[PDB]
Amino acid sequence: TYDALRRQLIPSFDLLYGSAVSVVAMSVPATARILDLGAGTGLLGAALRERLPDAELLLQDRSQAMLEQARQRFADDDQVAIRVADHLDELPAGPFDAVVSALSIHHLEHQDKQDLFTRIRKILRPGGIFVNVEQVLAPTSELEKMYDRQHEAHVLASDTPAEEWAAGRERMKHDIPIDVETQIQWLRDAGFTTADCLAKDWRFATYAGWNG
Ligand SMILES: C[S@@+](CC[C@H](N)C(=O)[O-])C[C@H]1O[C@@H](n2cnc3c(N)ncnc32)[C@H](O)[C@@H]1O
Numbered sequence: 001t002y003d004a005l006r007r008q009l010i011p012s013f014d015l016l017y018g019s020a021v022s023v024v025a026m027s028v029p030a031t032a033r034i035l036d037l038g039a040g041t042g043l044l045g046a047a048l049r050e051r052l053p054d055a056e057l058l059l060q061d062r063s064q065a066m067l068e069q070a071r072q073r074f075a076d077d078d079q080v081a082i083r084v085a086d087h088l089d090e091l092p093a094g095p096f097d098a099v100v101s102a103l104s105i106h107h108l109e110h111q112d113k114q115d116l117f118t119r120i121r122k123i124l125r126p127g128g129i130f131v132n133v134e135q136v137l138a139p140t141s142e143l144e145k146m147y148d149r150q151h152e153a154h155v156l157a158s159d160t161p162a163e164e165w166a167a168g169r170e171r172m173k174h175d176i177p178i179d180v181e182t183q184i185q186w187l188r189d190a191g192f193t194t195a196d197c198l199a200k201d202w203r204f205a206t207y208a209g210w211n212g
């Protein structure tokens, strides 16, 4: 959604999205084929294009309304394609050098996350990278309260409109997050040979898996 609001709602936006861009740029060639899963308005795709002008981007989302904003953002870009599809629909064949996602996969049931990670590995080239900029759960209810306080601290310090934070709270009611270490293990289960948490700010983390 509108870029200024996203930075108000998401702690360490530049660290987390920047880490995603950096790990892709160090993992794949300038001419990488990249799938952005749950691309929304295309914020992560845009961050990648800024660093990788010659990359082929496929932006995928279930929402035509969200992808309309991505289409406007990439109106003049000859190396961007749009696919309307659910995460649970058949993935595009590729192959891809990188599959990336931001703040989307935490909307799936856990079993669907585990299956998705396996399906993603099948469309990745050998040595290909999967990167997730993700909303994560604390490993305990007591730490989850602390995560929540730290998230709210960022939102308030960012002078976020009360109505946008209240709307944010409402959207978060149907989140299905899990801790970062569990999700990283699910990458290993899916057959990624290396997986790591690159950057983290309490509730928000950038992690990656390599296919070889
Ligand atoms: C909070 S937005 C993140 C958008 C963008 N990736 C970003 O970083 O700003 C979550 C996105 O995931 C999409 N989404 C949620 N569940 C999905 C699903 N099951 N299949 C496909 N897209 C989904 C939503 O339509 C929305 O565009």
Ligand SMILES: [Ca+2]
Pocket: 103, 106, 107, 135, 171, 172, 175
């Ligand atoms: Ca969410």
